[PDB]
Structures are given as structure tokens and as C-alpha cells.
């Protein structure tokens, strides 16, 4: 049993809810919250900007130190940093940004990072300002992630479309 509430069960391991991932993290304080990161961990907008704002910029301060030491992530890659006030840990995962010309085939690699964690609160990778088709992102999620993932979908209209169209 875990603390996630009000989710629709899509599969054995994937759950979905129309929710602000910031507000969901604050309520649940999950072991892992996933950030929709870029390779520079520059948390300007989308999910990353919202998560970072909720940390009062502490996520960005930690991230800048991480990049100064390690250099940029790979598209499809991840790193584990603090979850600050939102979670124990933040898994910063870089899905391909279609609005920068990145190979959409890297979305499956991105979601494979989730398999290193038993339970996660996450957004749909490469959705929103990353430009991918969210219906595709949910299909890759279901077909790639084997651990327990709680997808908080920000847009109510998109949520209903994702549920209604789900095979
Ligand atoms: O961009 C965010 N989610 C991604 C998204 C939003 C709309 C349509 C598709 C994808 C976000 C922003 N702020 C808070 C929580 N999520």
C-alpha cells in the first residue's frame, strides 16, 4: 500500500491523475519525483520551472553545482539529486525535445531510467513544451516502465483525452 490517492489504474504498474505535479509532491512527499529536465539542468519553464519555483530556487542552486562538477547529462539520461521540500529525491530525466530536433526514439531510453526506482511520481516525458505527442509518451511509458509510476497530468483536457484514447 502507498499514499497516492485518486489515480486511475491503466496497467499492472501505471497509474494516472489530472493533477499539478508540484501540488501532488507537496501532499505525498514521495520517495522520488521525476523532473522533466534538460541536459543543462536549467529549470526555466514547464514542469522543471514549476518544480524549481516550489523549491525557492534551491533545485537550481544544487543543479548548477552538479553541472559544474559533472558536465551536462545525455538526452535519454538522468541523475538523482535532492527532492528538497517536494520529495526525498528528484530524478532529473532528459526526454528528447522535439522543438530542438532530438530523436524521439530516445524517449524509450529516457523512461528506462524510471526502472531504477520502485515507485515514482512523474510527468509524461517529452510532453508539454518538449513538443512530443503526449499519447505517444504514455504508450512508451506503459511499454517501458516496469516499476510503479504515478503520472500526474497537469492539463484536464489532455488527461481526459489520454484516458479516453488509452489502449
Ligand atoms: O508544463 C507542465 N506540464 C507539462 C504539460 C502541460 C500542458 C500540456 C502538456 C504538458 C507543468 C507546469 N506547471 C506545473 C505542472 N506542470
From Swiss-Prot:
Effect of residue 31 to A: In strain: Mu/B.1.621
Domain Macro: 1-167
Membrane topology: Multi-pass membrane protein
Catalytic activity of the protein: Thiol-dependent hydrolysis of ester, thioester, amide, peptide and isopeptide bonds formed by the C-terminal Gly of ubiquitin (a 76-residue protein attached to proteins as an intracellular targeting signal)
Summary of activators and inhibitors of this protein: Inhibited in vitro by GRL-0617.
Localization in the cell: Host endoplasmic reticulum membrane
Taxonomy, superkingdom: Viruses
Role: Responsible for the cleavages located at the N-terminus of the replicase polyprotein. Participates together with nsp4 in the assembly of virally-induced cytoplasmic double-membrane vesicles necessary for viral replication. Antagonizes innate immune induction of type I interferon by blocking the phosphorylation, dimerization and subsequent nuclear translocation of host IRF3. Also prevents host NF-kappa-B signaling. In addition, PL-PRO possesses a deubiquitinating/deISGylating activity and processes both 'Lys-48'- and 'Lys-63'-linked polyubiquitin chains from cellular substrates.
Subunit structure: May form homohexamers. Interacts with N protein.
Annotated protein name in UniProt: Papain-like protease nsp3
UniProt source species: Severe acute respiratory syndrome coronavirus 2
Gene (name only): rep
